[PDB]
């Protein structure tokens, strides 16, 4: 017998989150129950000046 | 590679001029080349029971 080859490609862009400058908007957290979660919240407290 | 396939071709069978049945009919005889061998004339000596 004999093959009738192709060929592969394999080199892509790798991109990182923590690598993009993006991620300086964001205040990453890895939490890894997080589907679990329902709503989360923060209440703030602020007296008047 | 998607696929393969075969392929063949054969080597033509063999066959001797001497190796034949019919030699035996034939009385072959090497020779050089027929150049000096200008007469068509053959002498033979019969011998007479």
């Known amino acids: 017998?004999?093959?009738i080859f192709g060929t592969?490609?394999?080199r892509l862009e790798w991109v990182?989150?923590?690598?993009?400058?993006?991620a300086a908007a964001a205040?990453?957290?890895k939490?890894?129950?997080?589907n679990k979660?329902?709503?989360g919240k923060m209440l703030f407290?602020?007296?008047v000046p």
């Open 1 to 3: 017998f004999e093959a």
């Open 8 to 10: 592969f490609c394999n």
């Open 16 to 22: 990182y989150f923590l690598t993009s400058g993006l």
């Open 27 to 29: 205040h990453a957290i």
């Open 31 to 34: 939490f890894h129950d997080l």
């Open 37 to 39: 979660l329902t709503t």
């Open 45 to 47: 407290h602020v007296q």
